[model samples]
Target chain A: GLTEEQRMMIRELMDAQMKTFDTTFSHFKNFRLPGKWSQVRKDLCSLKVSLQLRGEDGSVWNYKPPADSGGKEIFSLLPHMADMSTYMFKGIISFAKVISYFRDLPIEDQISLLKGAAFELCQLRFNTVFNAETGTWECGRLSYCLEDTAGGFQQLLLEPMLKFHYMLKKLQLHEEEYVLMQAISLFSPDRPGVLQHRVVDQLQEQFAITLKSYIECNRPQPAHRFLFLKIMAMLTELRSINAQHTQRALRIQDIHPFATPLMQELFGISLTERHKILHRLLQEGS
Target chain B: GLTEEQRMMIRELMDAQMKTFDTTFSHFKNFRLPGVSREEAAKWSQVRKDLCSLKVSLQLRGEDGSVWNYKPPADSGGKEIFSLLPHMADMSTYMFKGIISFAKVISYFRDLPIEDQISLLKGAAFELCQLRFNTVFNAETGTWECGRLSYCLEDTAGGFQQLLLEPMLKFHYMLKKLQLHEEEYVLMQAISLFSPDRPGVLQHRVVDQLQEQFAITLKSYIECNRPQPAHRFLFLKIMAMLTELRSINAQHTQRALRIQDIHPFATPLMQELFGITSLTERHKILHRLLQE
Candidate 1:
């Protein structure tokens, strides 16, 4: 039994995301594979993400979406594919939190913020599309691009924006440094390989003092890993290795064939090499 | 259980590949993710193709990679990330076939001399990579990759060198023309991009032939998705639009996501366009279809 206010908060959140997913879901059924497992349910309902329950553990266990596709035709393969994203969404949220407070948040608050971040991620999980009877997961009941092109991106953008703001506030930067970091991190690399083209460029350049101070403070911090990696939210600020090269630094390499596969990422490859370097550099005695 | 010569014949056929995967298998045990489910076995232990049975499937039943770390770990969470390049090995016999035809023997038997080219241009599925995995059908293993990098790569190269000769021969009129004025840069860029380090891609020519569809679609997709992050994204976009192909089978989805994940390049859109249905659905659907 919960208060009407809590229910309303969830309902509002659900409705907003619903419109985005439903529009995309319909478009999806239209373009499915020819041999697809289609609706045994289509005679019944439209398939769409609906209400969901998020626990304190941040697990988005119970989920409900619209019923149009419940009986409508959807390629049978979706439910299985859909499950992958629910977990992926959870991982992305955690990753954002891990890097959120790298610059200045107090340590205790950092952990709390992360926990809260995980809980917030459940909202995305609720949006994942699945077919219970078939026991499958379609990563998107909502094709993000399908909706974003139509402006449903507005709902999704709010979460990341709020997360960034909360993160910025936690950094507890002096006004000058805060503004400066914002410019360098956000504005500088707004363009492809040109962080300098961000809309915030002029403001950062105009307030040079703020930028300098933020950099100076984080120069010798313990959370330097976070500072170095998490500092840039967009690739524009970062330089990635595009040309094929013989060596990749800080890499994720498999030492044993029996070992499980790790993440495959594209960066300077040199960045991946650095992880091994760090691991080797930090010896047990040291 | 069989005769010695038969054992030896089979051994001769797959000697190097076994060792490569044996070594790769050793490397597999080291995989660790402190907070997620352990990567499990893939159901298709073997795949069958034309008469020959080559191991193509890398059973990655439920192992998501770094993405799992972003979320909490579980003992057996559906593989948060797993990858097995869907391809058959470039067998020695096949390599031998490509080489002889490519040489364009001035004198040879008619049937033995046809360049081994087939009619109707049955592509996509005809590729060394696309033969349907017969594991579900309980057939022998037919598709796979890597005897381990060092060995697998060489065999892959042998296969490619044979095919590449065809293109070079087809356009030999330009060979003399281009050599006359071509700067070293053209050849250098070609050399660099063509020969990559990955095991499955050891044969440069096979990689090139495979790139036919992907290259054009990818170049076009990137031109459209642009200045966007991840070279892998361009490939994935092509994959997603296979909604254009009107087909996103498990093989297609896995290939797209597996390669993109290895590329470690994720676009906001590609990330959202995640692989939803695990191939386990294939088992159930096919099984249920049979029962029905």
Candidate 2:
């Protein structure tokens, strides 16, 4: 029943979905360093040095805390985690800005998308440093365990987060796949208060197809077959963890303020009032 | 990366999944039909008859119960519903047989451990039954036309919470509106049967792979059969229905337990499927069935 026009559109959309990964990866590969030069073969010189970095050792942020002085620091990990989260939040904003489709959305829609997806995206990003074997969040030069959050966060919240982290980490996702997942999560149209549902839905669908195609086209046989579902199920698990995290955060904030201003804004605790005021001012100005 | 061999396997699996529906439906269509070269044109044009029947009037079975001998009495509501329970349990048993046959036809299902197989069937039996019953659902009348009986929501609503019946009806109507092809229904049932995250599923990885195969096959079928742009969300809609099915299943179990507390029945199979009985006992039932 597809008309010629419709078939063409489908083809174009499929092509665009496939190209998204290629273009995104090309950007990543050529991100910072480049040189186009003519040189003789004999002039080539090579040196080798090893940093002893494993594939799982890379942190999303480059922050290095001071060495532990052997003195017990009470409740210090939460602040450091918050600081790293803020850095990752900025990275997510930068990442979102680079996508043309995201930029096409209305300003309010953009804010809603980021606000709704910020915590989930942080989870996915932090998953990069998650040591599943050790069951710890290995941020740069610091490792946080479930025991560390014993008193601060409720078990209901921490349990699912750890499970989500381990499940996602077991997928052994590549860098490009990680970014595509983040994009898919960020463009979720069903997020609360999203204004442009249709546009965002289409964007999310495209990104999802891109991720599916990327996995099918890249991963080894048999393993690639179920990897997409495994990874996507992690998104569902993330939703559950997101709910628990919100509930836990709200309860904790009721008793004490968040550890950092960035944490407050990230969790929308303090931003709610400011957002209401800004919205009212905009409404009055208009 | 997918090699030529793997691609062929995928194509073969898709073809087989599609053929499962075609084979099943063709059997249904040609069940009692008999035809060859006719004698003359006059033989074919002999009689024209009218018997009012709608598309949704068709049923899964042909058992016609006797006309309702109306003898109104006290406590007609709960007793009538409870009296119908044995018949529904029989229908559920019949549906489970078909499900077992369907699952056995799949080599992947046969390859699973017996305990895992029992766990999966126990988890998905009710959901699959719901999907099968949906095929004969008459949305216009809000009734399930099963054979000679048409079941209204109210008929089964007695002794059941509205939480279960309301959402169950909503799911039925929602899925029926899709006008799903026979292939889609069979594949969706298969997909639901292979749920990896089902409780007590010992082998998540294998079940997940099987589920993904069916999911991808269903997606591929929709892309080919339902080519319109508006059908883009059909896959997601179906998956969402599966999620809703989980909620309904939980509610169904709770209601069944509550009903058992009031009017207990000796329907062992129903009890096991509804979690009123332990899964270990369910394993025994499944073992006997599989052996048979």
Candidate 3:
């Protein structure tokens, strides 16, 4: 249903937003690597998170910080993970601004959409950091060599993210293909309980058609035509990683209580959710 | 980025497509009940064309002149297994409708090649069908919630039901525990429909992209709207239900179909859905429901 003018509008909006984000991220050029306790603490405070811990009886517990006991090794990477979370969330807002349709959506809707989509969208930013050849995700703050474990990255997230990024990198998608996916993902119609999901579905379909057209024209080889689906499958894999990451966050807090309001407010992991998950775990055990 | 007019166009297109699908599916008025919706005799002639022409010379024939030369797979009791076939077929037919209804709302799905469409159906049909357990099973009462129609789960498939019912109940209980929003169910169905790993699919990347888009959408939706957005594992756990279903199907197939003599009257749909048609289809279905 999209006319040429509408297609142009979406393309132009996306390009402008991408450029703004490019400039915004460049400001991090002078940043230092984060591993120190103070830096980590500052970053950690900006997020609300949960982590799943394994007890001696082999039961899993979803634990968040605050009023918790001793957790040491697991909580160390909270700083980097928080920084990663913030960067990803901010990027969505910036992109949302130029895409006026999403921008004009209710404030609650914008926040809600971010909550659902932030983790997946964040992976896109990390695309550059993944050095498939060297097997590391290097950036302004730290060098996450997937194998090295030199950075204080949680293994739960680190391992899966590494594998996912490696798989995605191997696909060698076109710039157009990648950009289309960003729009496609942002406009997912499947978000549960949105104000007007049909609108979002249409927006996503627009991007879907664009991506299809680009693939047909540029990468029409039979093999490449369907390769986009493979790349998309990796998104599902990445989501499981998000689950793993949240679980790891709890494990971190199990070592020490560092529950921040941001963790509760943005991430939606809190004492209540932990107890529910823990109860489920216990039930499965019994 | 869209102007008011452009957005309106997209909305109109979506509405028109929905109307078209609604009109198309209205033809299934004859399939009001699952059991009676069996493919018509003439319909099989057309269905076989999509089967890549399974014609070959010198096929074995039974003493009764049936194409299926029944070789019992080292079985003892034929009567018990024979009794459960009709019920299983009915359940299978019910599941086929569940799949058809699920994919019907995905606006662009019909635009894909029919081969890929069937590939996705074959892969996801059985798994998606299992979600209807609540209709047939009641968690609180620990009994079949078979509505006004009374039938035990065991009566549907003999011993296989008794063995699988517990795990199936566990899965249903887990979903009930999670308290997923009703809309989330639609997203989950969408995710299953857009499964990329189904074999014989011509446009898997397209499927993968759609699946990923839905997944991302589902997650963000949950995060913003649900009681516990941080419980990301809900998606993973929900998907695990399908894995449980796959294993249960395999066990049931092994017990009911493989270990016993094939009935001479098994329909093509029955054989294919239960993986009794050929070893390749069976192996393909069981290889991996979802990847590592």
List, residue by residue over B1-292, the lDDT tens digit for candidate 1.
4346433422422332233213222243322211212221222111111111111212222121101101211212233222111111123223222222322221111222111111101112112111111111111111122222111111223453442333211122222222211112111112222222322232445545433433443344344444545453544443333222223233433554544543333323223223223322322422232222
Q: Which ten residues in a row have the lowest lDDT in candidate 2 chain B?
A: B47-56
Q: Number of the top candidate by lDDT?
A: 2
Per-candidate DockQ vs. reference: 0.02, 0.00, 0.00
After TM-score superposition, what is the CA distance of residue B270 in candidate 1 from its true location, in Å? 35
lDDT of 3 by residue, A116-162 (tens): 66666667667745667765555532344432333333442335655
RMSD of each: 27.8, 32.2, 32.4
Interface root-mean-square deviation of model 3 in angstroms is 26.7
- What lDDT score goes with residue A94 in model 2? 55
Q: What is the CA-based DockQ of model 2?
A: 0.00
Alpha-carbon shift of residue B268 in model 3 (angstroms): 95
lDDT of 1 by residue, A108-218 (tens): 322222222222233223223333322233433322211111233344324332233334334343423322232233223232332223333453343343333335554
The 10-residue segment of model 1 chain A with minimum total lDDT is A241-250
lDDT of each: 0.27, 0.58, 0.50
Off by over 4 Å in 2: A1-286, B1-81, B153-165, B277-282
User: Once model 2 is optimally superposed onto the true structure by TM-score, how far is the C-alpha of residue B145 displaced, in angstroms?
Assistant: 2.1
Q: Which stretches of candidate 3 lie over 4 Å from their true place?
A: A1-10, A23-25, A29-71, A140-142, A149-158, A250-263, A269-286, B1-292
Error of 1 at A88 (Å): 7.1
